[PDB]
Ligand binder design. Structure first.
Ligand code: CL
Ligand code: CL
Ligand code: CL
Ligand code: CL
Ligand code: CL
Ligand code: CL
Ligand code: CL
Ligand code: MG
Ligand code: MG
Ligand code: MG
Ligand code: MG
Ligand code: MG
Ligand code: MG
Lengths: 397, 397, 397, 397, 397
């Protein structure tokens, strides 16, 4: 047995985002690290770990990750959701980290090994002008990326060019029709300039109503996007049947998921082509493996959410999952800055459009705890989540 | 308790339509006003209120709108339908008016308050020529409207350019193919001239057979109408699945509904994008709130029917519902003439494409009883409802 | 407008449970109180309110509850789940409390009034012997209760009479077959002694596997329980189809729900007869009203979860919902003790099997903030949630 | 890398069945052992390993079990089926053995560790009389078993009490009605004598036509069998819907499966409560983990086939899977005789109704190569598979 | 009775492929020949026949083909799959040959005679250039073929112009996008040059993911291919519904099938227009007839797989089945080489686009036993089955 001797939760903001790490110490002296990053509510996740998971977990056998996951998930009776799941994810990843270290193996080797040499990577280009897009796309192409998520225009902030009511309620405003029009124009221009040079992805980020999504699918399907992401919010994915029945568009969805009821009908009915779950939002590696296998039976492929608001520990974990799970398709990546790299040393970066899994024992990335102390948590409003349509209505952000 | 002391029903015809208002007096001294407008059969609604609802309601507690509504709906054993529901609606709306006045709140604040600053508005442009259309559209755009329901041609009357049988039966004649041809051409012409300057709506008004409706949807989907309204009659909406499976066209339906069985399967199967119910036809505010909530769970949005054959009291009520219900989308424009404005003082008018909810206590619009007496009920035959196809057969009007 | 001036969150444990109250102060000087009680993780809910909802909400208009609810729900981007929802519920209830106070009306009158005189109530009898059950049942019957949830045996703790593995993992042990056998025997004995004197309810509390649930339904259906509650866990309710296809048993489910995807298919497919949601777990009054209306269209009735781990504020709120919503069926009740009554004065208690809604302005129950300070939060392990079957497996608790 | 240096396949018959072991040697010096037992066609599996899998695998990296499995499955283009899957299983299991040995962990710890302390076990009682049954049951109960699979009568052989045609075709005869009659009587008798003392299982072994299966389910459901196994053959499992819609009987199925199309719709439609796959028939540990996860999402539990025609290596593997997979339920008992114990040293035996996973590195059971050579393959005709009904027609055996 | 006196299995490789023939001798002195060709695993098939089917079959009555098939199929208990089915097929075909020889009739006359004069034939044109394709196409049209399966490019081998990971794992590489692009261009060019001169077929050979298949279907439907073959792998055919709901493309699938669960739902749901099964893979003539009839009821037509890896005996059998079964559509043919013709004399060749059934007694084609000895089995690694995507992942080959 390997008895858990401590549980710690650290919030660090080396750069733009409040990142959250969980650290598990064991009587073997082997230490694990995991990602619990829910950037919008980090103090809630920390409270959850410090006040509840810690006294629950100290004294228990770290070897039995599966029991610990099943036990943790139901421990508050009420369950699922972002605060509990991220806290559990932090522990779950750290426990797998310890197991891999004790096995003296890279994490993906514990799983049963590689099913691919490395995972393909897509990056992000966003500009308010086509010329600006071209500038970023050109750089990415020169670096060997073959997949780029492109966006024309920025959506939010003050309603400068939007016909609102007289005294619009405070919020981040956009117009769905302007957004649709700019996006179609973007695809048309990118295909005219670049042809089939690279794969174009685009993130709808739940901006649209169902009728707008169906129209939009028919408008861009001719451009064969690698995928169109979050074309609807999680609560309206039954409307995907309307799209799947009449459009060939490739669809990805699910970074928002933190309850299994959100994805089961989605996958069984083949409503998307790629699942986009944020691994820490679904409770860590343990459920990620199961969900990977579930998708596989239905022919659904995997593109785990990999935003900047996630530790490099979490990213390395996703790369281990991505080189192992046969139905993994692509990894999202954004560049790390120097502070982040200092707090989380040895974070892999894409090489010629590929991310390579770590080959040392464990996850392969840890947190430098002294460095992390230099960057304490900092309150952020996240004003973009107060997203409003011209009439002042809230829309899923 | 707030005991009901009197119930009255007034039919008034300030301008082109017979309007119906129910007036509820209480022992608190607070009076409520409601819309019961079924313009085609007004004496029947008045008989229903005066002879049956009045002796039922006098003496009962106006506070308990929900009990009174559930009780009223089943009071005749047989139920649903346009005459009973309209009479009940008049009472139901007046009871809400009373409750809001006693609470000293605008009606929408009772409901739980605003979910938007104001509701967007669409107006109506109809002409026998394109230039006549352009004339009306230019005027509306200049007034700030962003949504216009357009129709080229008038359909009905003597069969002048229509090959009928030798001695055609008396009726109001049209040719469905001429109607389709003109409407497709109209859409084409408007997009050429105006591009994406405004949202174009069109009301099919149940003119078509299902195969025609399906053909029409494929013919106009490319023009992205904001919605195509009543593309089928209420009894044939299962045919919408054929449309939904192969077309992206945005659909609205339901102004004719007066029985819940007409809408449940519609909404459950996502057969339309907007519900168009006439609030008084479904029994008033009480069922309108439930239906709005019902639609919201399925992702269906709301565009309550707001024709000229409705009191300004009913319009105000609809704007109260529209600024409250989160899934409300748009409100139909009704320009009020001098006589109607005198009978129903303080009726809101759109300002720069928006209708604003009233902010005084209650509904915010009452009927001037003296002014209404000046304009008594007048029989109208509504010949357009005897709608006939070229072979002389009735079609749903 | 009524600007929010403060937001406070208090945890108090006057008796057995950590209760959580949210208090909203406004520039009008009118103060609201709401329930945010997630007893197993109270510090997490408090963190959520103090650190996040408070700076978000101060300065905003308390009148617009609907916008504030829609805005709050999506404010962390990721959403749903027990920690966020309870925090939002606390604010939502307090906002309705303020609106009712300003309207000078009892909460249920804001909603549209009563649809019943009072709500029927069921209470709880639990013993390890039939004789002990009879003793409690006899008292309840004498007090006028007509509905009693009965349980024979206590399930959990050390595996004294259970054949486990040699060195069973620490946990709370029970045997599903012993539990089934005791429960069937209980119903058989109660019907033999009491006949149809009262309505018997029973809470399966997700103890069973699907095959056991189906067997159990067929075993007790002859006893016509008023309902059998939580016969399956939330993740396995599709298995209810097997039961609904072959058994007449009345079913209730849903106290665990905190994501709408958990209940939509459940209700649309008529898989249960009563919905059991914990109002604070689903985000407060605002979504409770909508869910009430949703259920109503499908003929599903309401029995909101009313456990001891909920403030009397929350209970009074449920009674307001129960006398208003036409499809409300029954209210669960457990007696308050003197400390709890001191901290939450004027809490209604059942009278002859009925709970009467409060008739003063507002919710009708507040928290005495000095009294609450006498009873600070106290860590509880809740060892019963580590529920294990004889082989040491975790089972949903 | 850990390069494969040799692949061997040994058929050994220590006792009643031809057993098949695959042995994988690597350059690390670490040797793996796996089960490839298809007892009816052992020379075919050995040809498959020796002639095709050996030259394919030598030189490749044993670490990457997942790639090797995906590659092996499609290597012959045509795929699935009992000969190929068993050969692949032998390799797959040996590769997992190797990985666990290198990690210096018991196999189940690699997977993520335990979710139960040990797995419950059922044994088998079969006799031509009830008293003979009682004899075996009494012995098993006294040994600590709580689950016994019971069968009254032996079915097959010469048609002694069976009205066949004049000159019946050579085969193993039985009468389905005699079988049903004896089994119903057996259940009745066991419940009268033993009541609820133990769980009774029964294996129908695809003996019945669908109308017989449905009749039988209704006849024995009252006796609450722990499961009724293989009530239909694999090709007729859609007939299970008729059973599921009207009966509570608990069902197990799937020992015959060797193609995923055989189980997907089964599990998706909840047609059984327990999956019974033979791990080597589905291709080894790698697909067994995925299938367990797949079943878990649908609430289906696992009872892998553990017959005597399987190596103790395969049994140990199944116990490793059974203590890991949370939805594992029970393991079939196989008493090992002296010769088999010598060939496969250290095979676990049930202790008080439980099988405990091995705790040394690797699978924990190997084959003694010298001992196995003592017991070479011996042809068996397995006459029972020529199973005939009274009219002389083949029925699935 | 016609007692089986011997069973033999000969592997012969006169040209590029290991071919497998089963020979059945009877006491009548009449000898039958059948195809058991599974070219990738021939030694496993031969073991199956020699070690198991032979001692099973000798002594039994060859007259009763139906019983012999039902008996053979379940004789190993576990069943279906390519090794067992091919062995059984060789026997089944030889028995049908024997029966037809005894009746002194061509095989298809046994079945009930011709339903057509002859079967239309398609050939294969494949090249890395369009002009290379044109030469082959031109050759075929001159010979009277009216159907040609066309392929531009060769896919596999070393990843020369493919961006792989740094050290790509050994395998046969292709890029799906490159393949789709070339194939779409091929269709475009062929229709430009040839118009509707001939029917163009194309074999996707399970190279694509579902989202790619759906895109491809929409890209080529305008070119009206006679059929697009194997657009998905057998385990993913439920994705065909997405294609069938939005595309008019003609589809064929099934050469991989060796388990009826692979085809039933496929055909019941009309997911393909042509079934493509390999007759020996499904177990011979006996199940080919039933499957032909099953398809016919559903309106599905037959294009049995007729690759070079099949004996001319098996090809003759397919022509007998094709002139008999009313729903047979077309026969694939590859030109025979001289050594193959020597070993299997008198094999029919297409004449002006038609294949004519043999008119002598029996199948019409036998194996020259002495000639076959000149060409013993030779190992081949079939490296193309290790098909990898650019990232190193195995894809179904
Ligand atoms: Cl921010
Ligand atoms: Cl808007
Ligand atoms: Cl008129
Ligand atoms: Cl406790
Ligand atoms: Cl157990
Ligand atoms: Cl035998
Ligand atoms: Cl096989
Ligand atoms: Mg995204
Ligand atoms: Mg209309
Ligand atoms: Mg409960
Ligand atoms: Mg069995
Ligand atoms: Mg092919
Ligand atoms: Mg379609």
């Amino acid at each position: 047995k390997n008895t858990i001797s401590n549980i710690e939760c650290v919030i660090t903001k080396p750069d733009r985002h409040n990142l959250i790490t969980v650290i598990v110490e064991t009587e073997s002296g082997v230490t694990g690290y995991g990602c619990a990053t829910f950037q919008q509510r980090p103090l809630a996740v920390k409270t959850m770990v410090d006040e509840y998971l810690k006294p629950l977990l100290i004294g228990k056998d770290a070897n039995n990750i599966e029991d610990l996951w099943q036990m943790m998930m139901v421990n508050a009776y009420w369950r699922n959701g972002p605060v509990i799941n991220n806290a559990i994810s932090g522990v779950d990843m750290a426990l797998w980290d310890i197991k891999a270290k004790i096995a003296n193996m890279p994490l993906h080797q514990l799983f049963g090994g590689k099913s691919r040499d490395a995972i393909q990577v897509y990056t992000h280009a966003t500009s308010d002008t086509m010329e600006g897009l071209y500038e970023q796309v050109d750089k990415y192409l020169e670096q060997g990326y073959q997949h780029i998520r492109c966006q024309l225009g920025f959506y939010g902030g003050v309603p400068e060019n939007i016909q609102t009511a007289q005294n619009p309620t405070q919020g981040s405003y956009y117009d769905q029709d302007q957004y649709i029009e700019n996006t179609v124009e973007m695809f048309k221009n990118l295909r005219e300039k670049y042809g089939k040079q690279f794969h174009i992805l685009h993130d709808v980020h739940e901006r649209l109503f169902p009728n707008q999504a169906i129209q939009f699918a028919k408008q861009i399907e001719q451009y064969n996007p690698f995928f169109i992401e979050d074309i609807l919010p999680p609560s309206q994915t039954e409307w995907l049947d309307n799209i799947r029945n009449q459009s060939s568009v490739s669809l990805a969805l699910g970074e928002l998921f933190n309850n299994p009821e959100e994805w089961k009908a989605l996958i069984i009915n083949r409503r998307v082509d790629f699942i986009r779950c944020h691994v820490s939002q679904i409770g860590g590696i343990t459920p990620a493996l199961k969900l990977g296998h579930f998708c596989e039976s239905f022919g659904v492929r995997i593109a785990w959410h990999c935003p900047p608001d996630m530790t490099p520990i979490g990213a390395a974990v996703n790369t281990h999952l991505n080189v192992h799970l046969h139905n993994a398709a692509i990894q999202e990546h954004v560049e790390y800055k120097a502070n982040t790299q200092r707090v989380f040393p040895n974070a892999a970066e894409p090489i010629n459009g590929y991310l390579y899994a770590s080959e040392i024992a464990g996850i392969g990335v840890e947190m430098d705890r002294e460095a992390a102390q230099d960057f304490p948590v900092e309150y952020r409003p996240h004003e973009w989540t107060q997203s409003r349509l011209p009439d002042g209505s809230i829309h899923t952000p």
